[PDB]
Nucleic acid binder design. Structure first.
Lengths: 237, 236
DNA sequence: TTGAGGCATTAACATTTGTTAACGACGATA
DNA sequence: TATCGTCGTTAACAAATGTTAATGCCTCAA
């Protein structure tokens, strides 16, 4: 839980905005029926995806509650882009706010205006950092960068390293995060990381045994976790 | 444009007057990180980062009017260690202390939404750019970056679309796409030259097949339509 | 006019990644 | 038990990109 997010929850429920329950594989919004929302993901795990005319899947970013995703601009109320927000956890809870009423809610209470503005600053800096590390070292650095992200957010200390508490993280789903189209390619990069004793693919889960190696290929992301998520970062250093 | 003028006159009421910078000058930097809210009013700049081993990265360009946050508003700490270099001859920007920003936005809520909107344009921009640069590797990354420059600094002419950037060397394009060696950028440009996509006149770039770049940057072209519809209409 | 340094082009090689396919392990259904 | 489907390896090949170096063009400075 988070303090600012819990007071925001009590603010929405006080104004008539009630929760909605989504189950795994469900889409809160999608790229084909654009509706300008403000998704306040309170509990659950989701991934922001995009599918091209070709049909290639792109895993842009994972979201873990509580956070704020918006599919439309605040002043114009027009689409910011055509993306899908798929629930990947077994169940998730979110507060769907029509883009228009949100304008009023934040106008009344500034404490929650700056909270939404803060998470937005977390998004901007996160995208620049992620874009920085994925671009420099090619696909190896992109797999290493993504595994660094998941290690901080879904990683727990274990005797065999640091286990990633994320189910159904197939080879395809890792490639989609780094723009790899073939599972055989992402698998090749994993084999190299196993031979270098960086990770161990024990029973359909990844165990990170050499965090410093990943920090080598994603310095701006580790820097971001330290500067933006100091609590999540400190629990592994 | 219009909403930035109201943010100018407003900033010209609370004693935060503009400062002038020249080319090669850094507004803020990564080694001495001061937290400011930059309101680039006029000029062109690039956001860069230098790794520990010296490699340069060009994250994106900024053309006024726009807003660049070097620090958070609640924690008042830094959002990351980046440099904002002026690449135009002259650029005017209003430097706002991060601790002052929170009190200034609470006064007028219409300018709060303005800074909020421009930040959403930043988020959407990064996702689209991240999307297109990842699918097709480096060829797509050069095409995407070229498509960006063609919309923002492009002007139609009898032959091609002139990308009006003084310094657009092969090394500077590679920094935008994560290519370390200029020879690799050239080889890719030689492929685009042979495929009738672009030509190279006076160390200046001309685009003749805009649709070809749209193939490799669908999300970025989608972004200009939704977020900068005026800049999009000039070429469609 | 001479000579230095930056930048683009091209080449030739090494490494990585795209692409397709065969093998084998595991789960599920009947 | 047998048999189909999915997913992970590993291979082999093609294509792209990393990397270095020689070359030619250009501006500058004396």
């Amino acid at each position: 839980m988070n303090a600012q997010a819990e007071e925001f929850k009590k603010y929405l429920e006080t104004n008539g905005i009630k929760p909605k329950q989504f189950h795994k594989k469900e889409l809160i919004f999608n790229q084909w029926d654009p509706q300008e929302y403000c998704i306040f993901l309170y509990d659950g795990i989701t991934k922001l995806t995009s599918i091209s005319e070709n049909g290639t899947i792109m895993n842009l970013q994972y979201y873990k509650g509580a956070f704020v995703i918006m599919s439309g601009f605040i002043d114009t109320e027009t689409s910011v882009g055509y993306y899908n927000l798929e629930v990947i956890s077994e169940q998730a809870t979110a507060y769907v706010i029509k883009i228009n009423e949100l304008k009023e809610l934040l106008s009344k209470n500034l404490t929650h205006f700056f909270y939404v503005f803060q998470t937005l600053q977390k998004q901007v800096s996160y995208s620049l950092a992620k874009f920085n590390d994925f671009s420099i070292n090619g696909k190896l650095g992109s797999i290493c960068g993504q595994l660094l992200i998941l290690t901080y957010v879904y990683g727990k200390e274990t005797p065999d390293g640091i286990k990633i508490t994320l189910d159904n993280l197939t080879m395809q789903e890792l490639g989609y995060s780094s723009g790899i189209a073939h599972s055989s390619a992402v698998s090749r990069i994993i084999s190299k990381l196993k031979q270098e004793k960086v990770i161990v693919y024990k029973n359909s889960c990844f165990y990170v045994q050499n965090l410093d190696y990943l920090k080598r290929y994603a310095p701006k992301l580790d820097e971001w976790f330290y500067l933006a998520c100091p609590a999540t970062w400190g629990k592994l250093n």
